[PDB]
Design a protein around this nucleic acid. Structure first.
Lengths: 14, 57, 388, 133
RNA sequence: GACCUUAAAGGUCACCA
RNA sequence: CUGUUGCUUAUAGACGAUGGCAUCAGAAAUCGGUGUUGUAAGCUUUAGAGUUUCUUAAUCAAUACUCUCGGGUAUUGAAUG
RNA sequence: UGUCGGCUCUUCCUAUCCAUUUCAAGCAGAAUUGAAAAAAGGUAUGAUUGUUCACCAUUUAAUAGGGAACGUGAGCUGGGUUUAGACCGUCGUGAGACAGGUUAGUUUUACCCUACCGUUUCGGUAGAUUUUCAAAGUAUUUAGAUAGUAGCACAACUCAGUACGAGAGGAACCGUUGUGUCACGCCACUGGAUUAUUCAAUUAUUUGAUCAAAUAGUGUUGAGAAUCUAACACGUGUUGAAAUAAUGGCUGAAAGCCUCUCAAGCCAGAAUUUCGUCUAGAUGAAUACUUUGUCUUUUUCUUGUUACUUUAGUACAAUUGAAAAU
RNA sequence: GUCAUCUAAUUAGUGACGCGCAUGAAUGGAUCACCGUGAUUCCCACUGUCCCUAUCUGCAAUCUAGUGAAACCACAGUCAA
RNA sequence: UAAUAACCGCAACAGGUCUCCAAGAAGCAAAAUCUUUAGUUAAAUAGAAUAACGCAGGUAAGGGAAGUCGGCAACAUAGCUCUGUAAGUUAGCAAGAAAGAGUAGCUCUGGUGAUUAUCGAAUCAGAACUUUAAAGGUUAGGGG
């Protein structure tokens, strides 16, 4: 059922 | 009252009484004297005690 | 849902908001209810807290299990040098409360009183009450004074005397006086003004205001502490050790849908410099005249009230003083506004006679052993210095 | 069975505190469960001082006393407590004697000193005490 | 409760949250 | 008049504020009182269990006696001058 | 729109468990049972379970029931449930399924607005002219519309082995003395922290040795003042008047009698309400000094304010406005 | 689940019983000595986990000189019904 | 240069990257701690005040898991010598089981050899005396 979480990264390549 | 270790005159409303299981009760003037008593230190070998100053001179 | 288990709320809602006062002196919010069937008398005074010590008092209450050799109790010392009465003011009862009608001042005013009306004395011209004093004996100005006296006798209900301390008699570095209005309770307004007029320029000693074994009310500003958290300010339960972001705070600051934080929640803020009134405090010794010492009827050695090494952070008490049972609000050097009890206590302990057996005067630093320095030298004997 | 009132004696004995049994009833140690007359509060543990009748279980003793719930009275305690006449006093160990509701001690003798506060509260304890301190 | 079977009785299903 | 500023200011204080003094101001030593610890460094007690070199002279020696109720610290948020 | 429970904390409901006041009983006393006023104050500690729930052991005056997005995760926890690893049982040929069980499994951001808590800065209330007066500025002494509100409960002595009752048993009012909790404080005495690295001792290393230190991020140990503080020390909240609710009554009609009143008029009666008392507090008032005395606007100096300076304009003493009560 | 035992108190643990929804023999059955950063229960010792919080230090946070971003943003920002 | 600034991670990134040489103290030890030769005092800025709430390191009266899903976290044991050591067992183990005692400083005594009277090694055992009664500065098992 309802789960929960998150994360990521990269933020382009300026 | 008179301190058990130092032998000083205990001022009124000052000091703590200690009671042992052998029916003997002592009263001390401060935690400095009480700690020495529980470490089995002889007041005769403690320079500032009133016991020591009576024994010598 | 309901809270699982019930417990009293932490903190009193009677002292909200917790705002710190602005002036060191605390003004009494009330005076004992006037009775017109007695001679005029003052109903208050003002003294400086000197410190605290302990006494052994003989129990005089009967039907009690207290020891017959005495009970160890604390006593607060309040040095109270005589005041100088420098005027009086009449109050009239209107439909919006008391309203001061006129104020009549004396011919000669001390510079301690004048310092209250400036904020930089060393740069001021110090011309306070100059026109009042210079034209005091003029025929025109004298006539105005008589009208003020007669106006009060006609259209006034409450008469108070403006009395100020003499700061030259205390070890405080402050030179500006402390002014307090002491209401006159007693006969009609005719004889109240006559009593007030008689007291102009004179000195009122604390023995004339308070009796012996009399319970009084004390108003003073407590000891400041600054910004303090929820645990110290209110006394909430410290959170478990596992808690993220901290332990010493309130976990829940309100439910979802009052949609706002209530005033009743415990929030971090200022604790300290508040005004508090404590009632029914007994006078143990009226340190005036013969009882200015620390000797008792049982302990006959002569000694002053000041412990060895002076009162900590205060100094030496050499004026009249009061011995109040227990604690009063404020640290040493604080200004305490004494007052006759608004509701006279009628308990058996209130009317109990006080008979002191021993007043402690040992040094309030460390674990002292001696009462006076003369008996310290006698016990210790000559030392390396003094004998050489 | 207690006689009269008791002054303030700071309670140094908690729930689950193990005391000694000064009686001669074959029970060695008792652990306090709850204190008679204790007025409850949230998250507070029951507290007992000298002269306080407690409800305790014997975890060490002869079989007719072990693994059972009895009633005892604290006669001495290691916690420092102050008398009304400015006397500060404390003992060497926490001890208790088994009494019933009516206040009569189950045993016949008490070993070691007995505090005044517990001696005055219970007249039966004071009679069988060697010394009252 | 639903489906099936016997001369009331059984048998299988009754799940994702 | 009021504010800034000074007392590396307090009975106050996150910063503002609040409270006190500002030339009879302030600050600092020093001295006395008052506390804390436990008897300083130098030399002397056959001190001292024993050892060595002598040939009863010394030397080394944990610890320990007298000078020593000594010495040291003490507002920094202690009290006097 | 972060989905259970617990922890923390505040508030609200009464269909009230205790304390207060009353009525009724098949209420002799004690213990009880039914009901009314009343929600201001209290309502606990543990074993087992993730549990809500439940069941036991205690204690208490009582250990009542509920709401607030099934209160409350940028408040916590992650025990359970609810991904991905693994095991067992049953089912399925198989991949795999299981309100079947077991075990391991990342809990992010407030520095924005408001709310709440504290804390500053600037602004400021219109109708008096007895120069003994009036107004503005600075400062003190006061004032109090409003808002909050605090003290509760128990035990012991005496009443008293008395009232009552055949007996068994078995009270209460006044009074006295304590305890617990809550609130406000406080540093004298008792206790705790202690980088005054205070005093002393001492392990390792380095100053040739002694002295005196340093280094081991506070080497460590004993004592340890000050300051802070106690659930660990100790003080105050035993406090006064009036009106009340449920209820019991007085006089008394309606209704010649009766009736406490779904009539007029009164009295007694609560942990109740309001004064009194405590805390914060608006417009205010008095006094001291500096001024001004028909008046402001716009510039302008000052950290800021008032007085003040200059050019002009404006007004110039004289008939207004009171019965009260019903 | 029922009986014992552990506790003052045991939906927990252990020892037994067994018509066992739906155990069971290389889908291995029963048995455990040593071993295990494996799962579970109970004792001793110790303790701020707790009664119930107090206090000490360094680095921040606070204020200032220099320097100086980001998430987010319809407009915005007091309540009751 | 070969890396807390020259290499790879967007960079002067607390991450990562193969080797050679190697002093004293103390100790079983290339352990922790301090120092010599060499290197450096700068390595994303500081000053004042010493509030709350924090991160890191601590202590605490009396009680001792009553807290909690759960002794999580922390406390506690800790070296060496001697005495002693159970059930169970694959007979190898368990076992450092568990449990108890000793340990400092100073002044001495004795054992263990080489060479043929002189010379040399740290190791063990024992005895008087003294004190603040001794592994514990650092390192260093909780047990059933």
């Amino acid at each position: 059922x309802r789960x929960x979480x998150x994360x990521x990264x990269x933020x382009x390549x300026x | 009252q008179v301190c058990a270790f130092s032998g000083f005159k205990i001022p009124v409303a000052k000091g703590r009484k200690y009671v042992r299981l052998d029916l003997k009760s002592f009263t001390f003037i401060n935690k400095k004297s009480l700690m020495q008593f529980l470490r089995k230190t002889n007041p005769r070998k403690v320079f500032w005690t009133a016991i020591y100053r009576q024994l010598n001179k | 849902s309901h809270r699982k288990f019930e417990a009293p709320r932490h903190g009193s809602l009677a002292f909200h908001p917790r705002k710190r006062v602005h002036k060191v002196r605390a003004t009494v919010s009330a005076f004992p209810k006037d009775n017109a069937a007695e001679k005029p008398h003052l109903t208050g005074f003002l003294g400086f807290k000197a410190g605290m010590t302990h006494v052994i008092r003989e129990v005089k209450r009967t039907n009690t299990k207290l020891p017959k050799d005495g009970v160890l109790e604390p006593v607060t010392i309040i040095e109270t040098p005589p005041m100088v009465v420098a005027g009086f003011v009449g109050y009239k009862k209107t439909t919006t409360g008391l309203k001061p009608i006129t104020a009549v001042f004396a011919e000669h005013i001390a510079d301690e009183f004048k310092r209250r009306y400036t904020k930089k004395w060393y740069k001021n011209t110090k011309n306070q009450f100059a026109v009042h004093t210079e034209k005091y004996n003029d025929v025109k100005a004298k006539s105005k004074r008589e009208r003020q006296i007669r106006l009060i006798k006609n259209r006034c209900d409450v008469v108070r005397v403006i009395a100020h301390t003499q700061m030259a008699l205390v070890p405080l570095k402050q030179k500006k006086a402390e002014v307090m209005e002491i209401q006159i309770n007693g006969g009609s307004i005719a004889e109240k003004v006559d009593f007030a007029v008689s007291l102009l320029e004179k000195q009122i000693s604390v023995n004339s205001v308070f009796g012996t074994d009399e319970c009084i009310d004390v108003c003073s500003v407590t000891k400041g502490h600054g910004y303090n958290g929820v645990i110290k300010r209110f006394g909430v339960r410290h959170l478990p050790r596992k808690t993220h972001r901290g332990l010493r705070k309130v976990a829940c600051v309100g439910a979802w849908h009052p949609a706002r934080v209530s005033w009743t929640v415990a929030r971090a803020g200022q604790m300290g410099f508040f005004k508090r009134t404590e009632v029914n405090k007994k006078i143990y010794r009226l340190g005036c005249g013969d009882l200015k010492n620390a000797k008792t009827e049982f302990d006959i050695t002569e000694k002053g009230i000041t412990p060895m090494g002076g009162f900590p952070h205060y100094g030496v008490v050499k004026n009249d003083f009061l011995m109040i049972k227990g604690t009063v609000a404020g640290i040493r050097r604080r200004v305490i506004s004494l007052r006759k009890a608004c509701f006279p206590s009628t308990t058996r302990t209130a009317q109990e006679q006080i008979v002191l057996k021993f007043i402690d005067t040992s040094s309030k630093y460390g674990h002292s052993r001696f009462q006076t320095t003369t008996e310290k030298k006698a016990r210790m004997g000559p030392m390396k210095k003094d004998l050489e | 069975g207690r006689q009269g009132n008791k002054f303030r004696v700071t309670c140094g004995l908690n729930n689950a505190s193990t005391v000694n049994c000064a009686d001669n009833t074959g029970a060695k140690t008792l652990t306090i469960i709850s204190v008679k007359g204790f007025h409850g509060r949230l998250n507070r543990l029951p507290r007992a001082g000298c002269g306080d009748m407690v409800v305790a279980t014997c975890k060490k003793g002869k079989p007719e006393y072990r693994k059972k719930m009895h009633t005892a009275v604290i006669i001495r305690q290691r916690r420092t407590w102050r008398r009304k006449d400015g006397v500060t006093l404390y003992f060497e160990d926490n001890a208790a004697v088994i009494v019933n509701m009516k206040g009569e001690m189950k045993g016949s003798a008490i070993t070691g000193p007995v505090s005044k506060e517990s001696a005055d509260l219970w007249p039966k304890i004071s009679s069988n005490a060697p010394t009252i301190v």
